[PDB]
Curated annotation (Swiss-Prot):
Name assigned to this protein: Lysozyme C
TM helices/strands, residue ranges: none
UniProt-listed InterPro entries: Glyco_hydro_22, Glyco_hydro_22_CS, Glyco_hydro_22_lys, Lysozyme-like_dom_sf
Enzyme Commission (EC) number: 3.2.1.17
PANTHER family per the UniProt record, alphabetical: LYSOZYME C
Top-rank EC class of the record's enzyme: hydrolase
Ranges for domain C-type lysozyme: 1-129
Chief subcellular location: secreted
Gene this protein is translated from: LYZ
Known tissue expression: In the egg white and polymorphonuclear leukocytes.
Length: 129
């Protein structure tokens, strides 16, 4: 599923991401935009054999089990296929663990390179939240 901007914003707000760990809703929407272009089915194969899954492009080397990444971990206790669901619950809950792992949202490269420091507030512009 490909989310609309405000549609995703509302869903993330519903799942408690607004101001979670000090990051406003705008940061999360911006992150999703540049990580996956709002596509829940997005996947990116990395050079080390791991894969990034879903709306927030969460990596299989540490966060989920895809059964095809040798020597990896599964800290979110979920199959990576759950991160490809149209229901963003799994991605959100795992993301909350990731952002609490000591590096804030810097864990998301796309967010760091295109969202951090900008007026992220513009990402929920015109939304009914």
């Amino acid at each position: 599923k490909v989310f609309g901007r405000c549609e995703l914003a509302a869903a993330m707000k519903r799942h408690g991401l607004d101001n979670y760990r000090g990051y406003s809703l705008g940061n999360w929407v911006c992150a999703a935009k540049f990580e996956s272009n709002f596509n829940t089915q997005a996947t990116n194969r990395n050079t080390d054999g791991s894969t990034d899954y879903g709306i927030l492009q969460i990596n299989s080397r540490w966060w989920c089990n895809d059964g095809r990444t040798p020597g990896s971990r599964n800290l979110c206790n979920i199959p990576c296929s759950a991160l490809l669901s149209s229901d963003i619950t799994a991605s959100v809950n795992c993301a909350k663990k990731i952002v609490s792992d000591g590096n804030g949202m810097n864990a998301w490269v796309a967010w760091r390179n295109r969202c951090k420091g900008t007026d992220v507030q513009a990402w929920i512009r015109g939304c009914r939240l």
